[PDB]
From a paper:
A plant called Arabidopsis thaliana has a light-sensitive protein called ZEITLUPE (or ZTL for short) that helps it keep its circadian clock in sync with the cycle of night and day. In Arabidopsis thaliana, three LOV domain containing proteins ZTL, FLAVIN-BINDING, KELCH REPEAT, F-BOX 1 (FKF1), and LOV KELCH PROTEIN 2 (LKP2) act in circadian timing and seasonal flowering. Recent research indicates that their divergent roles in the circadian clock and photoperiodic flowering may enable interrogation of how chemistry regulates PAS/LOV protein function to select for signaling pathways. These proteins retain analogous elements, where an N-terminal LOV domain regulates activity of a C-terminal E3 ubiquitin ligase to target clock proteins for degradation in a time dependent manner. LOV domains are typified by blue-light induced formation of a C4a adduct between a conserved Cys residue and a bound flavin (FAD, FMN or riboflavin) cofactor.
Dark and light state structures of V48I:G80R confirm concerted movement of Q154 that is linked to conformational changes in V/I48. Light state crystals of V48I:G80R were obtained as follows. Prior to setting screens V48I:G80R protein was exposed to a broad spectrum white flood light (150 W), while on ice for two minutes. Comparing the dark-state to V48I:G80R grown in the light, confirms density for the C4A adduct and confirms direct crystallization of the light-state. For light-state structures clear density is observed for the adduct state in two of four molecules. Difference density maps of the light-state molecule indicate that adduct formation is coupled to rotation of Q154 to a buried position. Unexpectedly, rotation of Q154 requires concerted movement of I48 that reorients the Ncap. In the light, V48I disrupts rotation of Q154 to the buried conformation, thereby leading to a predominantly exposed conformation regardless of lighting conditions. Further, the light-state V48I:G80R molecule indicates partial Q154 rotation to a buried conformation that is impeded by V48I. This impediment does not allow robust sampling of the buried conformation under any lighting conditions and coincides with constitutively high TOC1/PRR5 degradation in V48I containing variants.
Numbering used by the authors:
A (entry chain A): 14 to 129
B (entry chain B): 4 to 137
């Protein structure tokens, strides 16, 4: 199976909703595709589906760089704490890469998750 | 009663490929189901090989087809070697010989410390007018 989680967001809709996750994402995070479709990926920074705030131990500096990289259309790589649906911790080595469309808009961002 | 993974797999919008950037000549270590379905090549046929077989017209042609854009192929080579990103359209072929326009994105993965361990390819297959006739 894939060595990594794969995520595709729609870069044209507001706030990068997920339109696809692969089976490694589902297996490792314990969320199912149907639960996460249309949501922003940031719920992974909250400890389980009932925590309403980002966890203190997710590095706000990395989050902030992710936001910037997305805003500016440029690739990203870094590591931040995430959580499985059962609230258990995940170290997510994350790479984001924009997909440019026919001309010359970003249509998609791809996320690649190496859990380490 | 568990809930299965992969329920919306049929909606995957692109091919995904992973190569081992450490081993020689970027051999493929994973392809997803979109890749298989669109190219007609099934994972067992492609693992261990370089992705360039897709530039040959089907599995019994040993060399890249002359209508594949050799300039673009060169840039791909350069971006991989320089450890940088690539996005471009490239003519490929299904196993059945039919033409494929492959909007390919390559992105390197840096590992623990602190070198490229993988490359991810993302394929958005799009339409062409290219048609090699009956
Ligand atoms: C394609 C894509 C994949 C993402 N994957 C993750 C992820 O796996 N884990 C995570 O914490 N954030 C991920 N994010 C980041 C959040 O969705 C969001 O960009 C981040 O939390 C910063 O924005 P914010 O301050 O508004 O929360 C991803 C973003 C995109 C666009
Ligand atoms: C991760 C990855 C995915 C690739 N995807 C394929 C592809 O789908 N189609 C293709 O023609 N080449 C693809 N390539 C490109 C070839 O493998 C090769 O790098 C390219 O043709 C340039 O090298 P060459 O001139 O030695 O053949 C991919 C390369 C990498 C690293």
């Amino acid at each position: 199976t894939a060595p990594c989680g794969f995520i595709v967001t729609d870069a044209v809709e507001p706030d990068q909703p997920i339109i696809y996750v692969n089976t490694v994402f589902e297996m490792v995070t314990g969320y199912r595709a149907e639960e996460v479709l249309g949501r922003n990926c940031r719920f992974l920074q909250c400890r389980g589906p009932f925590a309403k705030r980002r966890h203190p131990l997710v590095d706000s500096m990395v989050v902030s760089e992710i936001r910037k990289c997305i805003d500016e259309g440029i690739e990203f790589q870094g590591e931040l704490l995430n959580f499985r649906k059962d609230g258990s911790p995940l170290m997510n080595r994350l790479r984001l890469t924009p997909i440019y469309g026919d001309d010359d808009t970003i249509t998609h961002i791809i996320g690649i998750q190496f859990f380490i």
